[PDB]
């Protein structure tokens, strides 16, 4: 219907230049990314027949 | 009667080499590592750059 | 509707290694196979004319 549109904008320079406690500021942390690395283990199920 | 045994099919049991029988195997091999593919970009021939 | 799906899986090694009386176990027989071989007998019917 156009009432609710999707947008995305960058961060203002005044907030980006001073990030994570610059010029006496506080509680303005960076955003961080990491990798998880998790494993899956499978098992060999058997099968057999007789005559 | 030295039973070969198996893991209890529990993921931790397989990953730790545990086995309900006699011997305990070294490790659960390595079949490979999957990484999520980086999504592709749309290029900038739809919007002028003007650096 | 997907409520009743169709599956197929093997046997756990702990239950397949000891099948039909190993390590003192019992009441775990195998699954067996074989052939029947049944026969059909036909009869030669005759057919004739005269001039």
Curated annotation (Swiss-Prot), chains A, C:
<protein>
    <recommendedName>
        <fullName>Major capsid protein</fullName>
    </recommendedName>
</protein>
<comment type="subunit">
    <text>Homohexamer. Interacts with the portal protein. Interacts with the capsid vertex protein that forms pentamers. Interacts with hoc; one hoc molecule associates with each capsid hexamer. Interacts with soc; this interaction reinforces the capsid structure. A total of 960 subunits of the major capsid protein forms the 160 hexamers.</text>
</comment>
<comment type="similarity">
    <text>Belongs to the Tevenvirinae major capsid protein family.</text>
</comment>
<comment type="function">
    <text>Major capsid protein that self-associates to form hexamers, building most of the capsid in association with pentons made of the capsid vertex protein and one dodecamer of the portal protein. The major capsid protein self-associates to form 160 hexamers, building most of the T=13 laevo capsid. Folding of major capsid protein requires the assistance of two chaperones, the host chaperone groL acting with the phage encoded gp23-specific chaperone, gp31. The capsid also contains two nonessential outer capsid proteins, Hoc and Soc, which decorate the capsid surface.</text>
</comment>
């Amino acid at each position: 219907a156009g009432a609710l549109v999707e947008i995305a904008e960058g961060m203002a320079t005044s907030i980006a230049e001073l990030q994570e406690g610059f010029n006496g500021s506080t509680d303005n942390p960076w955003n961080e990314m990491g990798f998880r690395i998790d494993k899956q283990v499978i098992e060999a199920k058997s099968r057999q027949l007789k005559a | 009667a030295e039973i070969g045994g198996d893991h209890g099919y529990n993921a931790t049991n397989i990953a730790a080499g545990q086995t309900s029988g006699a011997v305990t195997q070294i490790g659960p091999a390595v079949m490979g590592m999957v990484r999520r593919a980086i999504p592709n970009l749309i290029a900038f021939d739809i919007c002028g750059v003007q650096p």
